[PDB]
């Protein structure tokens, strides 16, 4: 879900420093700035590290997975116990690790959000520029580090 | 070439009127800026003070750095520069600014977009508002102060 | 300051709990001398003479002299400023997170301020002694995307102008070659005037388990730690001779003279992590805090160092 | 000014700081003499 | 392209070795100097040190300066540089120089001129002689000991 870590059969030996980070359970951006306007919003599946777009119907509208011409922000906490995501608005830029749809993506790859809400490469709606390598963390689930400013 | 001018002069300056006194090219920053504004630093390949910058990449041994330019690949506008350690404040396309910025070698009220070098030039793809008149500050360097708050469709 | 800032007087209650940098076994305790300044430069001047041709005949008249030239190095370091953000819960709020055994958010991994803080301290430190091993400054385990840093600023693997020798990788499991290579790089060693001290060497664990094997029809009650040590104090003029083991080299080993004279480290009084005073507060009960460190001051003599690499396939 | 004695109220957080230094230098001193190769 | 260098260097310089230890940019004037030699100073246009150099008139606002540059222009060679005062040591090719200067980018007695831009070239009328081999300070940076005894016939 969000964090599996619960679940281990052993302590973790505490030692090295490097490769560390890139984890599904690494919640926010790798740089963060005080400035960021942040929105809590109720959300219908698991938008989490993803692009997440509004659904109204009566109740409040929600947030769900997706992307396309409907994007309208970045999924990068949620808390399951609330069922709320914490939102990083299109205005607003963002940097931190994000769901791709396959591990072909490279550094200079310019990304868009799919209606999935996973990053796939390329006109372009967002600009979006993958900094890393496609990281295969899990058999389906693959990290990579993306820059998103504004649409174009 | 340089954020201060680089011969050191040999007159005081005199202080005592108070007007036209920052068409500089020391004037680092905005004319207007707020206490909420989003700033960011990086590593500044080439000189790309009062320019539009654009992410530039590298073989990977180091990190990612900012280069003069615009276009399709612009990602901000840089107001300052630290020259001893090299960084560069880059204001992010997505935060509206107000200040002087290069212009090309224009009337106010004019559309401007950012060239391949990241000079301001009368016009696409990028909101930016003349405010005032070309001020000329050496033979090949001209200012202009204008908004930019965002990208057009 | 106590009374108006809980924070403070947490990172002082705390502060004796945070354990000593490794890099301070690489060093004499005359090697090290603090410097007060944050971000900048120190400059230093050095002179040398040297001979411009054969010297001259006296002989009858003549009035062109050979000449002795002179010339003057300006050496420089700097020193750079680097900082952290950590989240962690605000004080006013441990209450509602407190359990049986444990304080903070495991759902959404949040700590107190003052854990938070510490593992914090400890990565930094980590990442410091890392710096000063190697240079370098990465947390990629391919030691890719680093830091660009400013030049003048070196670590012990990486410093310029030193010995450099290459292990062939068909020869990596030999330890004959390696001693070879290791008596060529000795040999090519410059220590001069300031001979008579002390060396310290520096291996990684494999290295340091081949070390142990007896010398070699094997011989006995002699190991290549021996031979090695023995080596060394024929060129130290039978000094001490210091072996160390660290888990950040990787098939390099390291040898160098432990006098003041050659190899000198003046970090800044702020190289180790610092809480700033600034802490973002919200209405919700998470919190922000910064933390700031200083890096850079490694100064050497030329070809004094031996850096030999073990190539692997 | 330092942390290791009980007995330093710092006025402000410059004194905080430098208390800081000043302790972790104690602290590399006393390393160092209680240090056996 | 500058007599010290402009980059300030980040170690120690280790004096041990007393041999090779003489091939330095730095090293200004001439291997063997005699106490009966004519030096005079001008003003320096550009970088001429360690070139021969020549006279170089203006508009006649100014005084004459001297320049990098050779063939049937040349008037001296430049040993030195005071760069404050923007000052450049010359001895006249009257007078016989023997010292280090830049080479075009050679082997011991291979007769060298000097090109237009103050760089000395394997062969007219200036009589130089190479007394060792090219020595490499940087990619496009040659210096060479030679000997410089006036100019020569045709």
């Given at each position: 879900?969000k964090?599996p870590?619960?679940?281990?059969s052993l ?15 690494a ?6 700035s005080?400035?960021?306007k942040?929105?809590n ?7 989490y590290?993803?692009?997440?777009k509004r ?18 922000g ?5 808390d ?7 939102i990083?608005p299109?205005?607003n830029?963002?940097?931190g690790?994000l ?10 790859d310019k990304?868009?959000?799919?209606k ?9 709606t ?7 390598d496609?990281?295969?963390?899990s058999?389906e689930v ?5 820059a998103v400013?504004?649409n174009? | ?11 005081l ?5 108070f007007?036209d ?18 700033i960011?630093n ?29 276009g ?10 630290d020259e ?15 200040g002087?910025?290069?212009?090309k070698?224009?009337n ?6 950012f060239?391949q ?5 009368k016009?696409?793809?990028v909101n930016?508002?003349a405010?005032?008149?070309?001020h ?13 708050f965002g990208?057009?469709? | 300051?106590?009374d108006?800032?809980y924070?403070?007087?947490?990172v ?8 000593d ?14 410097v007060?300044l944050q971000?900048?430069?120190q400059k230093?001047?050095?002179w ?10 006296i002989?009858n008249?003549?009035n ?13 370091l700097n020193?750079?400023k ?10 006013t ?14 759902n ?9 803080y ?6 930094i ?12 400054v990465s947390?990629q ?19 310029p ?5 290459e292990?062939?990788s068909?020869?990596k499991?030999?330890?004959?070659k390696?001693?070879?290579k290791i008596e ?13 001290t ?5 291996v ?9 094997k007896?010398y070699?029809?094997?011989?006995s009650?002699?190991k ?6 023995q080596?060394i ?7 001490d001779?210091?072996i ?14 432990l006098?003041?004279?050659?190899i000198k480290?003046?970090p800044?009084k702020?190289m ?13 009960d998470?919190?922000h805090?910064?933390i ?9 003599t ?9 190539k692997?396939? | 000014?330092?942390?290791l ?14 208390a ?14 209680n240090?056996?190769?």
């Amino acid at each position: 879900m969000k964090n599996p870590q619960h679940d281990a059969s052993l302590l973790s030996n505490s030692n090295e420093f490097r490769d560390k980070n890139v984890e599904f359970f690494a919640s926010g951006g790798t740089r963060t700035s005080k400035f960021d306007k942040l929105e809590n919003h109720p959300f219908l599946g698991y938008p989490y590290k993803r692009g997440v777009k509004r659904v109204i119907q009566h109740y409040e509208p929600h947030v769900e997975a997706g992307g396309g011409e409907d994007l309208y922000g970045i999924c990068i906490d949620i808390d399951e116990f609330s069922k709320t995501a914490t939102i990083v608005p299109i205005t607003n830029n963002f940097e931190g690790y994000l769901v791709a749809k396959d591990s072909t993506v490279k550094v200079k790859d310019k990304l868009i959000f799919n209606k999935d809400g996973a990053l796939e490469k390329v006109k372009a709606t967002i600009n979006a520029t993958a900094l890393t390598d496609a990281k295969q963390i899990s058999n389906e689930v693959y990290l990579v580090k993306v820059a998103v400013f504004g649409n174009k | 070439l340089m954020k201060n001018p680089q011969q050191d002069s040999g007159l005081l300056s005199n202080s005592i009127d108070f007007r036209d006194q920052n068409l500089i090219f020391s004037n680092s920053g905005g004319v207007c800026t707020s206490s909420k504004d989003k700033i960011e630093n990086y590593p500044a390949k080439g000189y790309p003070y009062k320019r539009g910058v654009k992410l530039s990449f590298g073989d990977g041994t180091t990190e990612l750095e900012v280069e003069a330019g615009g276009g399709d690949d612009l990602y901000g506008v840089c107001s300052d520069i630290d020259e001893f350690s090299g960084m560069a404040t880059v204001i992010p396309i997505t935060n509206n600014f107000t200040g002087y910025l290069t212009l090309k070698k224009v009337n106010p009220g004019d559309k401007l977009n950012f060239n391949q070098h990241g000079e301001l030039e009368k016009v696409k793809s990028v909101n930016a508002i003349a405010l005032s008149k070309a001020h000329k500050l050496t033979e090949d360097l001209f200012i202009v102060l204008a908004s930019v708050f965002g990208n057009r469709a | 300051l106590f009374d108006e800032n809980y924070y403070a007087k947490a990172v002082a209650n705390i502060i004796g709990e945070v354990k000593d940098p490794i890099m301070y076994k690489w060093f004499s305790p005359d090697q090290i001398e603090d410097v007060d300044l944050q971000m900048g430069y120190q400059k230093t001047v050095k002179w040398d003479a040297f001979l411009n041709a054969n010297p001259t005949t006296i002989a009858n008249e003549v009035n062109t002299i050979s000449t002795i030239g002179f010339s003057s190095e300006v050496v420089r370091l700097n020193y750079l400023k680097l900082q952290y953000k950590f989240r962690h819960l605000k004080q006013t709020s441990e209450k509602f997170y407190t359990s049986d055994s444990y304080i903070g958010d495991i759902n959404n991994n949040l700590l107190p301020f003052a854990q938070a803080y510490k593992l914090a301290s400890s990565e930094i430190i980590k990442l410091i002694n890392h710096f000063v091993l190697t240079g370098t400054v990465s947390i990629q385990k391919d030691g890719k995307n680093q830091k660009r840093l400013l030049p003048n600023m070196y670590g012990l693997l990486n410093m310029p102008e030193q010995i450099k020798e290459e292990v062939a990788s068909g020869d990596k499991d030999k330890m004959d070659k390696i001693f070879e290579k290791i008596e060529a790089g000795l040999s090519k060693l410059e220590l001069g005037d300031e001979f008579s001290t002390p060396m310290m060497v520096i291996v990684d664990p494999a290295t340091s388990l081949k070390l142990v094997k007896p010398y070699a029809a094997a011989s006995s009650c002699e190991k290549w730690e021996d031979v090695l040590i023995q080596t060394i104090k024929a060129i130290n003029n039978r000094e001490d001779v210091y072996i160390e083991t660290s888990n950040l080299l990787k098939h390099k080993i390291l040898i160098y003279p432990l006098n003041s004279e050659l190899i000198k480290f003046k970090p800044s009084k702020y190289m180790l992590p610092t809480p700033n005073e600034q802490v973002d507060k919200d209405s919700t009960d998470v919190a922000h805090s910064y933390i700031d460190f200083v890096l850079g001051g490694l100064l050497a003599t030329r070809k004094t160092i031996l850096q030999v690499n073990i190539k692997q396939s | 000014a330092s942390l290791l004695d009980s007995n330093f109220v710092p006025i402000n957080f410059t004194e905080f700081v430098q208390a800081i230094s000043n302790t972790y230098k104690q602290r590399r001193i006393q390393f160092y003499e209680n240090l056996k190769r």
